[PDB]
UniProtKB/Swiss-Prot annotation, chain A:
This is Toxin subunit YenA2. The gene is yenA2. The isolated toxin complex includes 3 peptides starting between residues 768 and 778 of this protein, which might be physiologically relevant. Semipurified toxin complex consists of at least YenA1-YenA2-YenB-YenC1-YenC2-Chi1-Chi2. The Yen-TC:K9 subcomplex is about 26 nm tall and 22 nm in diameter with 5-fold symmetry and 5 copies of YenA1, YenA2, Chi1 and Chi2; the chitinase subunits may be solvent accessible on the exterior the complex. The Yen-TC:K9 subcomplex has no insecticidal activity. The native complex with additional YenB, YenC1 and YenC2 subunits is 16 nm taller and is insecticidal; the toxicity-conferring subunits are present at about 1 copy each. The lineage of its organism: Bacteria, Pseudomonadati, Pseudomonadota, Gammaproteobacteria, Enterobacterales. It is found in: Secreted. It comes from Yersinia entomophaga. Part of an orally active toxin complex (TC) with strong insecticidal effects on larvae of the Coleoptera Costelytra zealandica, Acrossidius tasmania and Adoryphorus couloni and some Lepidoptera larvae. The TC has an endochitinase activity. It comes from the Bacteria. Disruption phenotype: Cells with a disrupted yenA1-yenA2-chi2-yenB-yenC1-yenC2 locus are no longer pathogenic in C.zealandica larvae.
UniProtKB/Swiss-Prot annotation, chain B:
Semipurified toxin complex consists of at least YenA1-YenA2-YenB-YenC1-YenC2-Chi1-Chi2. YenB and the N-terminus of YenC2 form a large hollow shell of beta-strands. The shell is closed at both ends, within which the C-terminus of YenC2 is probably found. The Yen-TC:K9 subcomplex is about 26 nm tall and 22 nm in diameter with 5-fold symmetry and 5 copies of YenA1, YenA2, Chi1 and Chi2; the chitinase subunits may be solvent accessible on the exterior the complex. The Yen-TC:K9 subcomplex has no insecticidal activity. It comes from the Bacteria. It comes from Yersinia entomophaga. The chain holds residues 272 to 406 of 1487 of the full protein. This is Toxin subunit YenB. Residues 389-698 form a 5-bladed beta-propeller domain which closes one end of the shell; the other end of the shell is closed by the RHS repeat-associated core domain in YenC2. Transmembrane segments: none annotated.
Length: 34, 135
């Protein structure tokens, strides 16, 4: 069997010590599921 | 600096008791595992001839003549000293000095009246601040 557990992601950019890191993400679909 | 550094005094083979100076910028070394204090810098070097013995003529009280006097001059600072100049000198029998031209030097003096202002670092401008730096 094969299936997704979880995930994370990141960017290297030194935005500044606490500056506005801001984005959004979603799967459009995991077309195969179940 | 024991004998009179004055150009208008020819030094003497005997130095009296003024006593050798200690440099402004004294320190020590350690590197052989011991105290190594560093203190005395010279300013006059003297050529002495026992004239009548050289003549093979006389030996009683033949205190040698100061043939010639190299003379040496330093810039002095709280942390360093080193030659501003040297000059050769000899002396007339009336004791008037005669001189060669001096020979000057000027090694780079550290100074902070020099120090200028700030500038930003567009090349770096955010790449530090706790973790954002490695090097």
């Amino acid at each position: 069997q094969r299936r997704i557990k979880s995930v994370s992601v990141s960017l290297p950019m030194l935005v500044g010590p606490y500056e506005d890191v801001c984005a959004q993400l979603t799967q459009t679909s995991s077309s195969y599921s179940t | 600096g024991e004998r009179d550094i004055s150009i208008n005094k020819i030094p003497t083979f005997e130095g009296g008791t003024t006593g050798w100076l200690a440099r402004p910028d004294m320190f020590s070394r350690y590197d052989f595992g011991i105290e190594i204090r560093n203190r005395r810098l010279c300013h006059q070097v003297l050529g002495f001839h026992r004239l009548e013995a050289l003549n093979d003529r006389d030996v009683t009280d033949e205190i040698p003549v100061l043939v010639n006097r190299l003379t040496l001059d330093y810039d002095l600072n709280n942390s360093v000293s080193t030659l501003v100049a040297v000059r050769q000198v000899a002396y007339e029998t009336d004791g008037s000095p005669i001189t060669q031209p001096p020979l000057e030097f000027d090694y780079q003096r550290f100074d902070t009246g020099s120090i200028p202002g700030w500038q930003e670092m567009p090349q770096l401008e955010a790449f530090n601040g706790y973790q954002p730096y490695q090097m």
